[PDB]
């Protein structure tokens, strides 16, 4: 299943794998790359699979001759379904803000290897998250 970007989905998935965990490549009507990152677990007393974990998903859309991503926060359930919930304990929210930037740092390097244009998220209007909170 190749993407409209022009590049092979086999190479993109394999390459993106070097920026984190194994990407879930399969069949889907929409052409987007969604990754599940784990920052901090909700609880520790109970089991891991029995509890959910915190982590913002990164969904980017490969353009014609460039790449673009966006910042989207949420939660990584065990069912692998879309679930948006509030972040408890500011201590954790701070961890996401840090990893958020570091995520783009490694993502930029990869795109640089393919010489793909990079741009900010249209959802942002000169109002980046407070990294120094």
Swiss-Prot record:
Keywords from the UniProt entry: Activator, Coiled coil, Cytoplasm, Transcription, Transcription regulation
Assigned protein family: Belongs to the Crl family.
Biological source species: Salmonella typhimurium (strain LT2 / SGSC1412 / ATCC 700720)
GO cellular component: a single term: cytoplasm
Role, per record: Binds to the sigma-S subunit of RNA polymerase, activating expression of sigma-S-regulated genes, such as the csgBAC operon encoding the subunits of curli proteins, and BcsA, involved in cellulose biosynthesis.
InterPro entries found in the cross-reference section: Tscrpt_reg_Crl (IPR009986), Tscrpt_reg_Crl_sf (IPR038208)
Lineage of the species this protein comes from: Bacteria, Pseudomonadati, Pseudomonadota, Gammaproteobacteria, Enterobacterales
Domain of life: Bacteria
Encoding gene, per UniProt annotation: crl
Name of the featured protein: Sigma factor-binding protein Crl
GO biological process: positive regulation of cellulose biosynthetic process; positive regulation of DNA-templated transcription
Induction: Induced at late exponential and stationary phases, and at low temperatures.
Coiled coil spans: 90-111
Entry's localization field: Cytoplasm
Pfam family, one: Crl
Main location class: cytoplasm
Region (Essential for activity): 99-122
